[PDB]
Amino acid sequence: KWWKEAVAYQIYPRSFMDSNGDGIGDIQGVISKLDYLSDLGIDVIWICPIYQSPNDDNGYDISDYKDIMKDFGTMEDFDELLDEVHHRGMKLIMDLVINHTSDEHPWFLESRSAKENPYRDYYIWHEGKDGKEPNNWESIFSGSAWEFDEKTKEYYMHVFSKKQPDLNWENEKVRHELYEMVNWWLDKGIDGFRVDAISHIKKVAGFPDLPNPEKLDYVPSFEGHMNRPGIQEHLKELKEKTFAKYDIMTVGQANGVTSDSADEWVAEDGGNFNMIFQFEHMGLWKPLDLIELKTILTNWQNGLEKINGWNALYLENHDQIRSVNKFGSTAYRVESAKCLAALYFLMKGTPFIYQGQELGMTNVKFDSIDDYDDVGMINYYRIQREKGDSHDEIMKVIWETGRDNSRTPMQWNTEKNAGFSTGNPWMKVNPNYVDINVEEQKSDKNSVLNFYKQLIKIRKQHDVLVYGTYKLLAEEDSAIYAYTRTLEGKTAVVICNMSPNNQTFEFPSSFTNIEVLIHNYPLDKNETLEQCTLHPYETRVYLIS
Ligand SMILES: OC[C@H]1O[C@H](O[C@H]2[C@H](O)[C@@H](O)[C@@H](O[C@H]3[C@H](O)[C@@H](O)[C@@H](O)O[C@@H]3CO)O[C@@H]2CO)[C@H](O)[C@@H](O)[C@@H]1O
Numbered sequence: 323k324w325w326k327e328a329v330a331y332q333i334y335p336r337s338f339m340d341s342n343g344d345g346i347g348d349i350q351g352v353i354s355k356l357d358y359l360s361d362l363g364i365d366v367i368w369i370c371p372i373y374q375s376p377n378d379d380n381g382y383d384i385s386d387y388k389d390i391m392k393d394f395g396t397m398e399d400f401d402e403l404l405d406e407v408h409h410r411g412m413k414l415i416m417d418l419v420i421n422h423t424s425d426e427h428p429w430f431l432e433s434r435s436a437k438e439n440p441y442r443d444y445y446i447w448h449e450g451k452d453g454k455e456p457n458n459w460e461s462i463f464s465g466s467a468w469e470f471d472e473k474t475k476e477y478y479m480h481v482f483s484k485k486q487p488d489l490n491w492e493n494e495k496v497r498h499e500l501y502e503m504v505n506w507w508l509d510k511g512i513d514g515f516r517v518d519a520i521s522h523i524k525k526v527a528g529f530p531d532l533p534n535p536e537k538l539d540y541v542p543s544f545e546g547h548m549n550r551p552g553i554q555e556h557l558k559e560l561k562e563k564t565f566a567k568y569d570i571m572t573v574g575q576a577n578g579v580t581s582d583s584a585d586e587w588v589a590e591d592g593g594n595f596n597m598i599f600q601f602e603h604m605g606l607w608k609p610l611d612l613i614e615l616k617t618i619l620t621n622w623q624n625g626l627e628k629i630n631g632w633n634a635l636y637l638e639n640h641d642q643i644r645s646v647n648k649f650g651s652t653a654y655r656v657e658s659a660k661c662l663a664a665l666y667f668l669m670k671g672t673p674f675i676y677q678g679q680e681l682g683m684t685n686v687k688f689d690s691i692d693d694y695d696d697v698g699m700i701n702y703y704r705i706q707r708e709k710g711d712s713h714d715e716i717m718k719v720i721w722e723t724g725r726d727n728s729r730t731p732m733q734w735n736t737e738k739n740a741g742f743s744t745g746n747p748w749m750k751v752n753p754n755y756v757d758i759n760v761e762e763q764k765s766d767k768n769s770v771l772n773f774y775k776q777l778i779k780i781r782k783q784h785d786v787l788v789y790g791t792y793k794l795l796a797e798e799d800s801a802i803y804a805y806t807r808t809l810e811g812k813t814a815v816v817i818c819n820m821s822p823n824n825q826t827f828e829f830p831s832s833f834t835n836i837e838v839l840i841h842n843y844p845l846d847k848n849e850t851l852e853q854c855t856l857h858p859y860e861t862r863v864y865l866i867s
């Protein structure tokens with residue numbers, strides 16, 4: 323329940339704060355900005371992976387689960403971070419990455435060392451077929467999901483990069499070692515986990531070929547490994563052996579789960595996590611189809627209420643483009659950022675803020691493929707260019723869909739590198755840091771930052787915004803997303819003009835008292851309650867008694 327009332331903040335540590343001038347974010351950098359997060363009103367910090375890693379996938383390829391990434395600092399730095407976070411009245415959850423390890427993990431170095439060795443079946447090995455890979459599966463990062471090992475003459479599976487071999491969850495020995503490691507972290511007193519790629523741990527037995535109607539080189543392979551039957555056996559055991567033993571929060575990153583099939587994932591009784599990140603609203607690739615967005619988020623609001631589950635609320639993370647670009651408007655950047663904030667943050671659930679979201683940071687456009695880092699898009703570029711795609715065609719995909727958009731340095735001020743670093747940043751800063759930064763926004767009472775500050779405050783001050791029941795209003799309005807939160811004798815009315823235009827809207831009224839809790843436009847003198855005249859991306863929240 324503390325995790326129900328919590329507001330969470332996600333840190334991408336490589337890009338949060340550099341404290342020693344090598345252009346790479348680090349743990350002492352995070353410590354140095356804890357005031358910012360405490361003052362914002364954050365309850366829980368989720369930090370992206372900080373473990374020993376070759377960084378083929380920036381921390382998600384782990385070579386030692388119990389050692390800190392050299393770029394980021396030492397275990398002593400981590401211990402200091404956790405101690406400072408806890409003394410500041412905040413909690414910290416770690417990123418648990420146990421679908422796969424680095425290919426430089428000791429387990430894998432042993433596993434690949436000989437066809438027969440005790441660690442061989444810690445990973446997923448198969449001999450080729452017809453002088454090719456064991457099957458036609460594509461990696462999520464493009465190319466084959468199998469990599470050949472010359473020494474042992476067999477392929478190993480990798481859903482993600484070539485340097486992220488999948489762990490074999492059918493091996494009891496693997497599972498036991500993973501559980502020990504998880505509990506080792508929980509014994510230090512961290513407050514839980516965000517659980518990475520967790521819907522991918524069950525593979526269809528025998529790894530059969532997938533249908534290939536378009537005759538591709540490799541077939542997108544989600545139907546072979548994403549949320550496959552049999553996965554719950556593993557996740558139930560994971561919960562029993564680790565999470566259930568501690569008072570923590572878990573949020574699983576669970577692609578391939580829909581609102582009608584979320585029962586085993588998040589139900590109050592028997593669910594294997596407290597909440598999950600679901601992906602259904604994050605794949606609407608214009609004028610945004612607002613009503614489709616209403617349908618999806620409402621499905622999840624209603625769906626989880628029915629089974630006493632809990633939603634994880636979010637519009638941004640390190641895997642997505644910026645939400646002003648995705649869901650709002652660069653033509654109305656500050657207004658749409660606040661509209662989007664009120665929209666997603668005040669539904670029933672635990673809201674997450676991704677670093678820079680609270681500033682209205684936006685997508686970047688670098689001209690050189692060398693300026694980017696994302697292993698997924700670097701692979702895409704190589705593969706598609708060979709196929710004939712032009713540089714422009716490919717950069718359009720990277721600019722418009724690439725997750726590097728969310729990994730540019732956090733924009734603290736207008737000093738060199740937006741104050742992220744004294745050196746040369748691992749990833750270039752967005753030039754718009756001269757306009758978009760924490761320092762500027764702290765001083766402006768109508769900043770995006772201070773709007774998030776207010777959102778956090780009203781949610782904490784009014785129980786209806788935490789536990790109140792959601793109901794969608796005005797479903798058929800293609801511009802206005804409106805909904806209520808109802809708890810006993812209090813009703814909150816959230817009104818979001820999700821369009822770049824002025825709109826009229828009839829107040830969806832029966833109250834003894836009405837109060838405006840938040841608004842991103844000045845209130846108009848002569849405007850009547852009944853007849854809303856909303857500016858582009860105007861949002862208002864009313865509290866009704
Ligand atoms: O540790 C590897 C990788 O894992 C995490 O993200 C992955 C998701 O778990 C996985 O389901 C898949 O999700 C993307 C889908 O491929 C795509 O169709 C669409 O739904 O966007 C999803 C989000 O990107 O792949 C992602 C990795 O792209 C973790 O969060 C990643 O940082 C990490 O690289």
Ligand SMILES: [Ca+2]
Nearest residue numbers: 340342346348
């Ligand atoms: Ca550094």
Ligand SMILES: [Ca+2]
Nearest residue numbers: 491492493552
């Ligand atoms: Ca099994």
Ligand SMILES: [Ca+2]
Nearest residue numbers: 846849855856
């Ligand atoms: Ca008006």
